[PDB]
Design a protein that fits this description.
This is part of a larger assembly, with four copies of chain A, two copies of chain D (about 50 residues) and one copy of chain F (about 550 residues). With about 50 residues, chain A is mainly α. In chain A, about 50% of the residues lie in helices and about 5% in strands. Chain A has one domain: DNA polymerase, domain 1 (Orthogonal Bundle). In chain A, α1 packs antiparallel against α2. The longest helix of chain A has 11 residues. Chain D has about 50 residues and is an all-alpha fold. Chain D starts with a helix and ends in a 39-residue tail after the last helix. In chain D, about 5% of the residues are buried. Chain F has about 550 residues and is mainly α. Chain F folds into four domains: about 55 residues, Sigma-70 factor, region 1.1 (Annexin V, domain 1), CATH 1.10.220; about 290 residues, RNA Polymerase Primary Sigma Factor, CATH 1.10.601; about 80 residues, Winged helix-like DNA-binding domain superfamily/Winged helix DNA-binding domain (Arc Repressor Mutant, subunit A, Orthogonal Bundle); about 80 residues, Orthogonal Bundle (Arc Repressor Mutant, subunit A). Helices cover about 65% and strands about 0% of the residues of chain F. In chain F, α9 packs antiparallel against α10, α14 crosses α15 and α21 crosses α23. The longest helix of chain F is centred in the middle third of the chain and has 37 residues. Classes of the chains: A mainly alpha (about 50), D mainly alpha (about 50), F mainly alpha (about 550). Chains E and F meet through β1, α1 and α2 of E and α3, α5, α14, α15 and β1 of F. β1 of chain A pairs antiparallel with β1 of chain C. Bound molecules: chapso (2 copies). The site of one chapso (1N7) has 5 residues of chain F, from loops. It is classed as transcription/dna. Keywords: DNA-dependent RNA polymerase, transcription, intermediate, DNA promoter, DNA unwinding, transcription-DNA complex. Escherichia coli RNA polymerase closed complex intermediate at the lambda PR promoter. Chains A, B, C, E are DNA-directed RNA polymerase subunit beta'. Organism of A, B, C, E: Escherichia coli (strain K12).
Chain lengths: ~50, ~50, ~35, ~50, ~100, ~550, ~50
């Protein structure tokens, strides 16, 4: 579905903006994830060019 | 920023009450057992040894 | 500028490196002359 | 600032110890003052308009 | 920030941080007096509660409430929630050079 | 387990009501907090347990959908197997104070005697520490010389000249005990006997006993330097260490005769021999300082440890019942500025102090002497850590007085009391009354909701008053350019002098003397040059843009 | 009026009789047209259908 497909994004800055922030932050923190801005939501929050 | 030297350690709640229980998964311990150990109602052996 | 964001657990040594001094007392301002 | 001193010395001005925060009519409003009321505290001395 | 009339306004974190220092200090004092372990255990539980309320208030233990009777906010509510920094793009970011 | 079928029914309904989450709970749950925890667990995995049944409005489809579901289910399936609240720090403390039977009826005096007889074994151990006695003799000769107040040595004793002459007799007995290095056997002991009729200052006794501990710990540090460097580092046998070193500990017949024993352990001690060699010298010298064989002081301080441990173990039971009392008293200081647990912790600290400062020689009800300390400590803490901005205690007292008198006047006058009239009642100047009125009010919360459809808060409407208006910055830049231009339109000497004098485009400005010595001139010529420059710039033609920057 | 019902009989005979007209606060009044003045601004108390 369109509601269980958006919960597969690979940029915790994106996924943490509309999902449960605590869960995304904890999962990203323990796994030591790197977010390399390559989306539109991410570069919008960070203030770069989409 | 500043920092406070806690007199005794403390459990970061996000990594305890997230309900995959990161600490629980890592230690292979049910959430209730660690809850008992933390709130001072039991003892947990770290080295049974001999 | 920067090119990525990395998130991980923070060690006590890391937290002591962020900080600029220990916060000991609980008192905020002086209530007569409002200096910190 | 390090330059404003030069201008002050040249023109020999006198920086005021008091700065004005006066009630001025909102922009885009034109009308006739039809009533003025003055309330004074119990200690202050009434001015020559009250 | 000092409001008009001599009245002050502050964000909740101040409160919580105070709540975490007093207790912490008290705990140290007890450890200096070699107090009986019942009270030191109670103090340690209190400090744990204070920290867990500071990081995320109301997660598990009936969030402590301020004088207003409302549940005071914590670091995990300035990030999360429709009213946090995240989701600010729900409706936010006033803009200069604009009119209507 | 009907709980599992409750979860399935909630999944099949797309929601759960409070009646549904009540009917299918275990029928043995009495504590509410467990119910709160289980409903929170259900909501974490879904489905949100609203309080009513509430068609065509789409609800959150499956936001709480994740593996967390099954794990959460397991947690629920495990909640029925056991029970326990553990969710209120107050409740655990109440249970633990319940466990200790609140029954010490005239056993308080028995434990007080236990303490008295437990803090005297430490006294006995201290007695055989002639170093502390030498310190006491020195301080006797010191205070009587008026280097410090005489009472610095005693909190009362068991008359000035009588005390001084008793200390002189102690001095005579001590010199005969000290210059009689098998003749010191009896003397010291006898001098200890008469010495046991004294009562020291708390600070003096504590410092002397801590110095005793420090000396014994220096001895024990040398013991480590001989032990681990050999037993745990050189593999010196533990039995061998107990054999040779233990018993002499000062001679060279237990280490320098340990390498020479011609054993596999012996001839391996050469590598670590230097540090033990030096430790022998250090310990031999320290034995001169203390004048006691190591084992003797070891045993007396071990006995001191026994005594102090006994004292603490009984103070535990002394404190517990009075902790019950502390709960009882502190129950009536709520809603001021502190949570209940802080109040009871302050009370417990006060009770510890009271027990540390109690004597069973006055026929007092312990529910009387201690309760005063408890209430005093509680009120002190409440006055000191109850408000964000800390107002001293006296201001708190004045505020309370003002509130009482204001209520009295309101009930009397039939209206509000004017601050002028209130200052008439209380013999205080009007300004002081107005100040105290302003002071008391506590700060607002910046997250107080405001009545707007945007659901903002009071913190979003607080402008910033320290910013520099973007027009002021542009004006400053224009001024910097214009002054550069006007300087350019001057003689080189005048421009250079002015820049240095006023600090334009430079670091810290320089004095007339400094600038004069700068190139090569006296100060007066530099002053003349500056005056000429300012005369030129004051002249019109070159003074049009700057006067515009004035806008006067 | 305060009466202490002296503590013998019947269920305490009355001997004390206090009588004081105490002040219990202010009751806002209704302007001639059904409007209240609460803080210098006229207000209206809407009826409720429960
Ligand atoms: C509108 C807002 C909530 C909705 C009611 C009400 C609730 C409490 C009111 C503030 C407090 O009284 C403290 C202070 C009193 C001063 O006098 C004026 C400023 C302050 C901040 C007040 C402004 C406003 O009136 C407040 C925020
Ligand atoms: C919009 C809101 C009510 C909306 C109906 C009114 C009611 C009280 C007003 C604030 C308070 O005065 C405190 C403070 C005073 C400062 O001076 C200016 C900012 C503050 C926040 C004021 C701006 C605003 O106007 C407030 C929030």
């Amino acid at each position: 579905g369109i509601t269980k497909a958006s919960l597969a994004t690979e940029s915790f800055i994106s996924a943490a903006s509309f999902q449960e922030t605590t869960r995304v932050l904890t999962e990203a923190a323990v796994a030591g994830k790197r977010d390399e801005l390559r989306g539109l939501k991410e570069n919008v929050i960070v203030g770069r060019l989409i | 920023m500043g920092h406070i030297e806690l007199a005794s350690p403390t459990a970061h709640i996000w990594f305890l009450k997230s309900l995959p229980s990161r600490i629980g998964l890592l230690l292979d311990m049910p959430l209730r057992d660690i809850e008992r150990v933390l709130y001072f109602e039991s003892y947990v052996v770290i080295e049974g040894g001999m | 500028e920067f090119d990525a964001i990395k998130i991980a657990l923070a060690s006590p040594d890391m937290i002591r490196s962020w900080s600029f001094g220990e916060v000991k007392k609980p008192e905020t301002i002086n209530y007569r002359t409002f200096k910190p | 600032t390090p330059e404003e001193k030069l201008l002050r010395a040249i023109f020999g001005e006198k920086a005021s110890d008091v700065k004005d925060s006066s009630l001025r009519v909102p922009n885009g409003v034109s009308g006739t003052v039809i009533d003025v009321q003055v309330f004074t505290r119990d200690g202050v001395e009434k001015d020559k308009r009250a | 920030v000092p409001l008009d009339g001599g009245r002050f306004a502050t964000s909740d974190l101040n409160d919580l941080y105070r709540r975490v220092i007093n207790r912490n200090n008290r705990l140290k004092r007890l450890l200096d007096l070699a107090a009986p372990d019942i009270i030191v255990r109670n103090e340690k539980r209190m400090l744990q509660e204070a920290v867990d309320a500071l990081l995320d208030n109301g997660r598990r233990g009936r969030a402590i409430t301020g004088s207003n009777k409302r549940p005071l906010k914590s670091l995990a509510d300035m990030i999360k929630g429709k009213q946090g920094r995240f989701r600010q793009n729900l409706l936010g970011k006033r803009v200069d050079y604009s009119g209507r | 387990s009907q709980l599992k079928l409750l979860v399935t029914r909630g999944k099949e309904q797309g929601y759960l009501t409070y009646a549904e989450v009540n009917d299918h709970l275990p029928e043995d749950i009495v504590d509410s907090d467990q119910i709160e925890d289980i409903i929170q667990m259900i909501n974490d995995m879904g489905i949100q347990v609203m309080e009513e049944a509430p068609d065509d409005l789409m609800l959150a489809e499956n936001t709480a959908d994740e593996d967390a579901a099954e794990a959460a289910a397991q947690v629920l399936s495990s909640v029925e197997s056991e029970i326990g609240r553990t969710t209120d720090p107050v409740r655990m403390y109440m249970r633990e104070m319940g466990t200790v039977e609140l029954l010490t009826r005239e056993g308080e005096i028995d434990i007080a005697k236990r303490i008295e007889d437990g803090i005297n074994q430490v006294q006995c151990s201290v007695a055989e520490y002639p170093e502390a006695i030498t310190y006491l003799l020195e301080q006797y000769d010191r205070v009587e010389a008026e280097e410090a107040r005489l009472s610095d040595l005693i909190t009362g004793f068991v008359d000035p000249e009588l005390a001084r002459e008793k200390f002189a007799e102690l001095r005579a007995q001590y010199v005969v005990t000290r210059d009689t290095i098998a003749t010191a056997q009896e003397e010291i002991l006898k001098l200890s006997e008469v010495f046991k009729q004294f009562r020291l200052v708390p600070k003096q006794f504590d410092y002397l006993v801590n110095s005793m501990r420090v000396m014994m710990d220096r001895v024990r540090t040398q013991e480590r330097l001989i032990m681990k460097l050999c037993v745990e580092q050189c593999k010196m046998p533990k039995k061998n260490f107990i054999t040779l070193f233990t018993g002499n500990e000062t001679s060279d017949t237990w280490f320098n005769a340990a390498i020479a024993m011609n054993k596999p352990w012996s001839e391996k001690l050469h590598d670590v021999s230097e540090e033990v060699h030096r430790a022998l010298q250090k310990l031999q010298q320290i034995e001169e300082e203390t004048g006691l064989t190591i084992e003797q002081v070891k045993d007396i301080n071990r006995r001191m440890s026994i005594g102090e441990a006994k004292a603490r173990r009984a103070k535990k039971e002394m404190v517990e019942a009075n902790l019950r009392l502390v709960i009882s008293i502190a129950k009536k200081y709520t809603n001021r500025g502190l949570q209940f647990l802080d109040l009871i912790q302050e009370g417990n600290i006060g009770l510890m102090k009271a027990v540390d400062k109690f004597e069973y020689r006055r026929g007092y009800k312990f529910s009387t002497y201690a309760t005063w300390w408890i209430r005093q400590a509680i009120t002190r803490s409440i006055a000191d850590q109850a408000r964000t901005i800390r107002i001293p205690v006296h201001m708190i007292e004045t505020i309370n007085k003002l509130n009482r008198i204001s209520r009295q006047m309101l009930q009397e006058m039939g209206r509000e009391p004017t601050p002028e009239e209130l200052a008439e009642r209380m013999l205080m100047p009007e300004d002081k009354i107005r100040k105290v009125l302003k002071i008391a009010k506590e700060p607002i919360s910046m997250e107080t909701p405001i009545g707007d459809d945007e659901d903002s808060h009071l913190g979003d409407f607080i402008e910033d008053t320290t910013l520099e208006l973007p027009l002021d910055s542009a004006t400053t830049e224009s001024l910097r350019a214009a002054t550069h231009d006007v300087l350019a339109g001057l003689t080189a000497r005048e421009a250079k002098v002015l820049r240095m004098r006023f600090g334009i485009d430079m670091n810290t400005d320089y004095t007339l003397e400094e600038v004069g010595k700068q190139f090569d001139v006296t100060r007066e010529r530099i002053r003349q040059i500056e005056a000429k420059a300012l005369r030129k710039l004051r002249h019109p033609s070159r003074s049009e843009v700057l006067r515009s920057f004035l806008d006067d | 009026r305060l009466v202490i019902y002296e503590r013998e009989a019947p269920e305490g005979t009355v001997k004390d009789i206090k009588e004081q007209e105490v002040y219990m606060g202010e009751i806002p009044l209704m302007t001639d047209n059904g409007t209240f003045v609460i803080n210098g601004t006229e207000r209206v108390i809407v009826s409720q259908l429960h």
